[PDB]
């Protein structure tokens, strides 16, 4: 009867219809709904348990600059920054804190290091004047949470009262049992009822850019659940 | 939809971005002030067990770690910013954490010494002793964390609404 | 009543008066007294237990060279040398085996590697001729021990007969429970009585230099104790 | 001041910088020569349990590790530097330690095989078998350590003063 | 001689070993201007109707802003204050230092009783408003208890042994 | 539990935030609110009792003149005047009835005497023509009173119906037990509830001038209260 699956921000067991993504909002700090999963017709019910079900959620943002004659090799940012689980070094991390891509030169761009104290990052390359650039740094200073919807956009409850910060979420090394993250709360729902994963943070996150090298979908969520067939 | 009636003793953790916490910059040779202040919210009761993890991750304004001879002291207070000798916990040095793996590793995870409790209106302070001719603390980059949610290792901070339980007042008087 | 505190080579719970530091002696190999802690007026008593109370003690020394036209990039030493808990690599250690500072160029100086067999170390930079230099390498080939004093400079006993070598002290990775160091002996004293921490080794250690980057006080001690209020 | 009357069975460890120990350089294919010699001090008794850690960290003169096919053998000896077949322990190879984490790790911590005892005047030697056409041992960089004080893992070397206990003579 | 009782009567002041002072600037509540400590194997007692008399001065030899505040306060060991046991939370004004000690009317007493075990501390915190002159310890003086007088009281002392 | 403290027009046990001062109004004679104290978060409650709790309140005003060639040595006033508890003499008073300060000559100005019958006062010095002057004479012809506010600017009651005149307040020698002032009424309040001290008088009082010699804050209030921790 019961199984233990993973569910992702796209498709998976659902089929890309009863998922929906969305960005947050910047100027009004508000508890937006960045993702939501609706139980399809075919399942009987879905469960969700804390301290039983593992999780992963790698968000990012997007920013841009303008090429100049001066040898920049460094860019400021609008988002608080830190390393992935802490380290000054690049390529030792579980994943890159930041990625950069040049529109003109359709190539990746490495990263040397950064201050990780102020909103700063180094670039290893020397961008030319007029060249367009994009960057997908780490995100910080946010809160994440869950809530349930009974087919109508009509809340009935909340999985767990207190929000967990995405900041801390990045801080812990993920994907290690014993050190794996496990939120609290014990939810369950049935056909056409929705779980919404909600965000409260200033910086504008992303889901799709169509010019990001390390995979198509920039960010990701991967959550464990229990299903009754 | 269905949600489980989670127990009142909720498992939580503390950090900078909360309402009932505050911080402010610090200079040098400067014990008396709380670099970080905590206060009990209204009609709640917080509980910190003896095996609770601890994790200060202070910084310098230029983005550096400070002199590891620096000292950190968590300390309970009576109301009115009035410290007390008994009930003190975590008199540690600022060095010997290895902030990279500190929370990450249960080895590096430095726990408290004795139990602790916070009645609805009480204070816990975090004093810092920096030797002179050193750089000061910068609140933008500093941080505290205590308790270990989201891990089979470590413990978590207990919280309960005072209005729910009847012996909440009994435990508050018990301290 | 009872607590479990840490005590350091400066101030702490005491107040910088009833501590005192001192260097060792070189030509007469003698069991000097490098540190000592006197129980203040306010406490009732202090205890000390082995296999109960953890510890840390990072010593160093000081040496100097003279700049020359020839590209040195390496210096010999007068002290036996090894890595911090063993490794050929720098920046992986729990702390740097060695630090160097240029008086003229008021900057740090990195380290590449060393032989760690003879009294040798590499420098990554290229010092200029005439430039003054200082270096604070690891220390080796010593013994450490404890003794008690009854207000008069008048010994009554010894915590533990057999000395432990500082060499081994550096060898073990510190600050790991299970692998943490825990000496033997069960001492206790009262008001104005002193515990002296003693050194027997050739090389001249240091406590203060006023030109050391990684903190003001070069060396350090951090010991666990139990106190009766 | 106050000190506790610690038990006579004190928990200790052995290393190079001690008076009742000695070493000497070794070349190649020289089994009979002991690289390291140990002797019982006067009116003391040493005890080495079976689960005692062991830790040789020999080196080459240039500062290198030697051929791991090299062999190390701890061995008890009767007086007059005379070996014995019984009582020997730790006939191991010089490889397969990983000196980096050796004492650090209880896994890498290689223990002895059987118990051992050292009466007041006795000898324990450490023979080494190096294959030919190899580099020799250098005493300046080599070292031995045995026993594990100062760690909840491992065991420690017991010592006692002979003049304290009455049945120490019977135990010897 | 008539054997005097162990409960001896004394008055406190600056020139004693078990007292100390240190200069103060402005807006410095935590710093004690004056510290007191219990000597060894003695017990001090301060009743509720005990007179009090600070005479803080400026470096130039002037009185400070009377909006300044003075607070005597008992402390646990390790320089640790306490809320209970505090006495004499008064202002620096309203003394008439000329007639303060001499006139019982202008003499100010404490509020509640007090006791000093052999190793304990009593501090005297001062709160000066900013943009004001600092305290000078050379000219300042403290007195509590009025020995040799009909009015007021005297500080009791007794040997613990 | 209970203590007996003093509270002042600045800071004190409160912390300079939950105090607020204000001046009165002149042309519409109205029961202004010159001072108010809000019970902070940390306390449990505050009490207030008459014939138990002493008090002090020294108000003043401000006026100015213009230097002239003629040797003035006397100024009229817009406020009824009398000595401090009555006396023709200056420097015998508990405090000076009046203070004067010259802007040009940044010095105090003594006072000889005054008529104390009409709105008159003497100056001992000889001000020059064009020199600017300030004076902070005693205040008279007023009423003072108390009232409570329940967090909202919304009165519930009044401590004592009948006002006491500040005139009489100056007349009695203050700070003498037996002759000390003790109003009537028995009030008590709790967190964030306010006690307002109110004024009804014509002349414009002051709290701060930044050029007053005898202390920074010109006027003052010092009231006894009882607090539950």
């Amino acid at each position: 009867q019961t199984q233990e699956y993973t569910i992702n921000h796209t498709g998976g067991v659902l089929g890309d219809s009863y998922v929906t993504t969305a960005s947050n909002q910047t100027s009004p700090q508000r508890e937006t709904a960045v993702l939501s999963f609706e139980c399809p017709r075919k399942f009987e019910e879905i469960n969700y348990v804390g301290q039983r079900d593992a999780t992963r959620f790698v968000p990012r943002t997007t920013e841009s600059i303008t090429g100049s004659a001066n040898d920049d090799t460094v860019v400021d940012l609008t988002a608080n920054i830190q390393p992935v689980a802490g380290e000054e070094v690049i390529a030792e991390q579980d994943y890159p804190v930041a990625v950069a891509y040049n529109v003109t030169q359709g190539v990746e761009v490495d990263v040397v290091d950064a201050d990780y104290a102020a909103d700063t990052v180094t670039l290893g390359t020397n961008p030319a004047d007029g060249d367009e650039v994009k960057v997908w740094p780490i995100m910080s200073d946010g809160d994440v949470q869950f809530r349930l919807i009974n087919q109508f956009g009509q809340e009935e409850g909340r999985v767990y009262p207190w929000s967990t910060p995405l900041y801390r979420w990045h801080d812990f090394p993920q994907l290690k049992r014993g050190r794996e993250i496990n939120l609290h709360g014990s939810a369950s729902w049935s056909e056409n009822e929705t779980l919404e994963i909600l965000l409260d943070a200033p910086q504008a996150l992303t889901w799709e850019d169509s010019d990001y090298p390390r995979g198509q979908y920039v960010t990701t969520l991967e959550q464990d659940v229990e299903i009754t067939l | 939809p269905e949600i489980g009636n989670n127990g009142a003793e909720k498992q939580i953790s503390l950090h900078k971005g909360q309402p009932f916490i505050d911080t402010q910059d610090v200079g040098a040779a400067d014990p008396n002030t709380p670099a970080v202040t905590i206060e009990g919210p209204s009609d709640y009761v917080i509980a910190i067990d003896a095996g609770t993890p601890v994790a200060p991750e202070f910084r310098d304004a230029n983005g550096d770690k400070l002199d590891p001879s620096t000292r950190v002291t968590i300390q309970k207070c009576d109301k009115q910013g009035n410290p007390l000798g008994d009930g003190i916990v975590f008199s540690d040095t600022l060095g010997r954490f290895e902030y990279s793996k500190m929370r990450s590793d249960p080895d590096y995870m430095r726990k408290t010494t004795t139990s602790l409790m916070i009645d609805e209106r009480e204070i816990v302070k975090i004093f810092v002793e920096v030797p002179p001719n050193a750089n000061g603390m910068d609140a933008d980059n500093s941080r505290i964390t205590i308790g270990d949610d989201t891990s089979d290792y470590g413990k978590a901070v207990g919280i309960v609404e005072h209005g729910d339980l009847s012996p909440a007042e009994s435990k508050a008087v018990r301290q």
Side-chain angles (χ1 to χ4, degrees), chain A, chain B:
Chain A
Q1 293 178 356
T2 62
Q3 293 80 18
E4 293 180 354
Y5 292 167
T6 300
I7 60 172
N8 190 359
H9 65 280
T10 186
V13 298
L14 296 174
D16 189 74
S17 67
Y18 293 165
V19 65
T20 186
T21 61
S23 296
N24 62 5
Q25 292 182 0
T26 62
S27 176
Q29 298 296 321
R30 294 179 66 188
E31 294 178 354
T32 61
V34 298
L35 183 63
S36 67
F37 293 164
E38 183 177 1
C39 183
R41 183 177 178 178
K42 63 185 183 290
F43 294 97
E44 294 292 328
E45 65 183 1
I46 297 168
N47 289 317
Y48 181 77
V49 176
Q51 294 179 354
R52 183 177 182 272
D53 293 331
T55 182
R56 184 176 180 179
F57 181 74
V58 176
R60 293 181 184 272
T61 61
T62 186
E63 292 184 356
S64 179
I65 61 169
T66 61
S68 66
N70 290 318
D71 57 353
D72 292 330
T73 63
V74 65
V75 298
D76 292 331
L77 295 175
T78 62
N80 189 359
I81 189 165
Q82 64 185 359
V84 177
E87 63 187 1
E88 190 274 331
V89 177
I90 301 299
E92 293 179 357
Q93 294 181 356
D94 292 331
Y95 63 91
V97 65
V99 176
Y101 182 76
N102 292 321
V103 176
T104 300
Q105 294 179 357
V107 298
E108 293 83 1
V109 176
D110 61 355
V111 176
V112 176
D113 61 354
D115 292 331
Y116 293 102
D119 295 334
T120 301
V121 65
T122 302
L123 294 174
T125 62
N126 291 319
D129 190 0
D131 190 0
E132 184 177 1
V133 176
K134 292 182 181 180
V135 65
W136 292 271
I138 193 68
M139 183 179 74
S140 175
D141 291 331
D143 291 331
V144 65
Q145 62 188 4
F146 292 166
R147 68 184 67 187
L148 294 174
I149 302 298
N150 60 3
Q151 295 177 352
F152 293 164
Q154 183 180 3
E155 296 173 357
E156 291 186 358
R158 296 292 299 275
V159 176
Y160 182 74
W162 293 94
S163 66
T164 301
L166 294 174
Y167 183 75
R168 184 176 178 181
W169 182 263
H170 296 287
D171 290 327
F172 291 167
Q174 295 175 351
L175 75 162
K176 292 183 179 180
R177 64 181 291 166
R179 294 179 182 179
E180 182 61 23
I181 297 169
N182 290 317
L183 295 173
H184 295 88
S186 64
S188 179
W189 61 89
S190 179
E191 184 177 0
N192 290 317
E193 295 172 352
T194 301
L195 182 64
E196 293 179 353
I197 297 169
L198 281 74
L199 189 283
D200 188 359
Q203 296 297 111
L205 74 164
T206 61
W207 293 98
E208 293 179 354
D209 292 328
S210 297
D211 59 356
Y212 182 76
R214 293 182 184 271
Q216 295 298 109
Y217 293 165
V218 176
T219 62
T220 185
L221 188 152
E222 295 175 353
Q223 183 67 44
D224 290 336
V225 298
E226 184 177 2
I227 297 169
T228 301
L229 295 174
Chain B
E2 293 180 354
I3 298 169
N5 189 359
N6 190 1
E9 293 82 1
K10 294 180 176 67
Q11 293 179 355
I12 65 166
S13 179
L14 282 73
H15 62 87
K16 185 177 179 180
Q18 292 180 357
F20 63 92
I21 190 166
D22 190 358
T23 186
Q24 64 182 357
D25 291 330
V26 176
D30 192 359
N32 290 319
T33 299
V36 176
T37 301
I38 297 169
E39 183 172 357
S42 295
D43 293 330
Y44 291 165
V45 176
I46 297 169
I48 297 169
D49 292 330
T52 301
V54 177
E57 187 168 0
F58 293 99
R59 295 289 183 272
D60 189 359
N62 62 5
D64 289 326
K65 182 174 73 175
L66 295 173
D67 189 356
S69 66
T70 301
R71 186 179 295 276
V72 176
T73 62
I74 297 168
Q75 185 175 0
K76 184 176 180 180
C77 299
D78 191 358
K79 293 181 180 180
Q80 299 177 351
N82 186 356
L84 294 174
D86 191 359
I88 190 167
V89 297
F90 182 75
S91 178
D92 191 359
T93 61
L94 183 63
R96 66 180 180 183
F97 292 102
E98 184 62 26
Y99 293 163
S100 62
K101 279 75 175 175
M102 182 178 71
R103 291 187 297 274
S104 179
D105 191 359
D107 294 332
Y108 290 166
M109 186 179 288
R110 299 292 179 89
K111 292 182 181 180
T112 61
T113 62
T114 62
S115 66
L116 183 63
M117 186 180 288
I118 297 168
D119 194 358
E120 62 185 2
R121 275 72 173 173
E122 291 183 353
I123 301 298
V124 176
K125 291 184 182 178
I126 297 169
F127 292 166
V128 176
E129 293 179 354
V130 176
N133 290 318
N135 290 318
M137 185 276 290
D138 189 1
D140 292 331
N141 290 316
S142 66
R143 186 177 64 253
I144 302 298
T145 61
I146 62 168
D148 187 1
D149 293 330
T150 64
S151 178
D152 293 330
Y153 293 100
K155 299 298 293 296
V157 176
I159 190 165
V160 65
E161 184 177 1
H162 182 74
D164 290 333
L165 294 175
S166 295
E169 293 179 354
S170 296
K171 292 181 181 180
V173 176
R174 185 179 67 189
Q175 297 293 322

